[PDB]
Design a protein around this motif. Structure first.
Motif, short mmCIF file in Angstrom:
data_model
loop_
_atom_site.label_atom_id
_atom_site.label_comp_id
_atom_site.label_asym_id
_atom_site.label_seq_id
_atom_site.Cartn_x
_atom_site.Cartn_y
_atom_site.Cartn_z
N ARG A 66 6.64 34.75 133.51
CA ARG A 66 6.76 35.76 132.48
C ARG A 66 7.42 37.01 133.04
N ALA A 67 7.07 37.39 134.28
CA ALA A 67 7.66 38.54 134.92
C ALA A 67 9.15 38.31 135.14
N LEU A 127 11.23 36.34 133.36
CA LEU A 127 11.95 36.36 132.11
C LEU A 127 12.07 37.77 131.56
N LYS A 128 11.00 38.56 131.71
CA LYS A 128 11.07 39.91 131.23
C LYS A 128 11.97 40.74 132.13
N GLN A 129 11.95 40.50 133.44
CA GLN A 129 12.78 41.25 134.36
C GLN A 129 14.25 41.00 134.07
N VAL A 130 14.61 39.77 133.69
CA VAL A 130 16.01 39.53 133.40
C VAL A 130 16.47 40.34 132.18
N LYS A 131 15.70 40.33 131.08
CA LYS A 131 16.19 41.10 129.94
C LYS A 131 16.07 42.61 130.17
N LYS A 132 15.09 43.04 130.99
CA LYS A 132 14.93 44.46 131.29
C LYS A 132 16.05 44.96 132.19
N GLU A 133 16.51 44.15 133.15
CA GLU A 133 17.60 44.60 134.00
C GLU A 133 18.85 44.90 133.20
N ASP A 134 19.15 44.11 132.16
CA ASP A 134 20.35 44.45 131.39
C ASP A 134 20.05 45.63 130.47
N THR A 135 18.81 45.71 129.96
CA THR A 135 18.44 46.81 129.07
C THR A 135 18.62 48.14 129.79
N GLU A 136 18.17 48.20 131.04
CA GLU A 136 18.27 49.41 131.83
C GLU A 136 19.64 49.64 132.50
N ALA A 141 -3.68 30.05 141.50
CA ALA A 141 -2.30 29.59 141.53
C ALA A 141 -1.70 29.40 140.14
N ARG A 142 -2.49 28.90 139.18
CA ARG A 142 -1.97 28.68 137.84
C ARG A 142 -1.79 29.98 137.07
N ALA A 143 -2.73 30.92 137.20
CA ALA A 143 -2.57 32.19 136.52
C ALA A 143 -1.35 32.90 137.09
N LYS A 144 -1.14 32.77 138.41
CA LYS A 144 0.00 33.38 139.05
C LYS A 144 1.29 32.73 138.59
N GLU A 145 1.36 31.39 138.50
CA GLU A 145 2.61 30.78 138.07
C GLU A 145 3.02 31.30 136.71
#
Lengths: 188, 56
Positions: free
Chosen positions: B16-17, B19-28, B7-11
């Protein structure tokens, strides 16, 4: 003899006077900046003969004349001879009476103030010119050459002013005025 | 005994996924200002003579 009230332009150097009307690509006539005077005793009666000769007359009859230049190293000191040259230039040969045309004259930016002041006074008071403008050689040279930017090194007859201009602006701290000109090269 | 490490490794991965998805969605989603332009030249190959200006 002109059919439009254009401005007149007269480039009165220490050497020769180039003159014609504004808007052209050349002076219409060139006169020396000279008033000549006889240095001999007349012998014959009824010979005409002037007390003084002006412009091309001074050179044409020069065999017995001493020829003087009213302008020294770019500055007019003999305004009376300047008025004679201008009257001849404008009324006899260029056929443009200044009374009916505004007139532009030329000079180095460091040419002592009396030059621009006296030239302005004579065109307004003895010629009744409707308007005047004394222009600077560095400005005039860049316009003639198709530039807004450059160094104007005018190796003329009188004085060399060496004036830099950038984007139409003077850069006066960089002006190098030199007391060397074509008249001195001739003397050497 | 391992329920919490999973559960902790997943959280950590889910955040992280995210936060990266938010900046990647605008990048793409939009990418024109991040590219470049032709920046062409004049040359004046048609300059067969002088211009109408008194300065030419």
């Amino acid at each position: 003899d002109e059919d439009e009230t254009t401005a007149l332009v007269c480039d009165n150097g220490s050497g020769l006077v180039k003159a014609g009307f504004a808007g052209d690509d050349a002076p219409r006539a060139v006169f020396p900046s000279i008033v000549g005077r006889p240095r001999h005793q007349g012998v014959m009666v009824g010979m005409g003969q002037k007390d003084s000769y002006v412009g091309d007359e001074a050179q044409s009859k020069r065999g017995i004349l001493t020829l003087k230049y009213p302008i020294e190293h770019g500055i007019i000191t003999n305004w009376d001879d300047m008025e004679k040259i201008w009257h001849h230039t404008f009324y006899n040969e260029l056929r443009v009476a200044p009374e009916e045309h505004p007139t532009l004259l030329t000079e180095a930016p460091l040419n002592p103030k009396a030059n621009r002041e006296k030239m302005t006074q004579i065109m307004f008071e003895t010629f009744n010119v409707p308007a005047m403008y004394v222009a600077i050689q560095a400005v005039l040279s860049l316009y003639a050459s198709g530039r807004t930017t450059g160094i104007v090194l005018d190796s003329g007859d009188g004085v060399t002013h060496n004036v830099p201009i950038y984007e139409g602006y003077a850069l006066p701290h960089a002006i190098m005025r030199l007391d060397l000109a074509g008249r001195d090269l001739t003397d050497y | 005994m391992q329920a919490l490490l999973g559960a902790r490794a997943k959280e950590s991965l889910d955040l992280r996924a995210h936060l990266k998805q938010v900046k990647k969605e605008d990048t793409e989603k939009e990418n024109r200002e991040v590219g470049d332009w032709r920046k062409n030249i004049d040359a004046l190959s048609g300059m067969e003579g002088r211009k109408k200006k008194f300065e030419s």
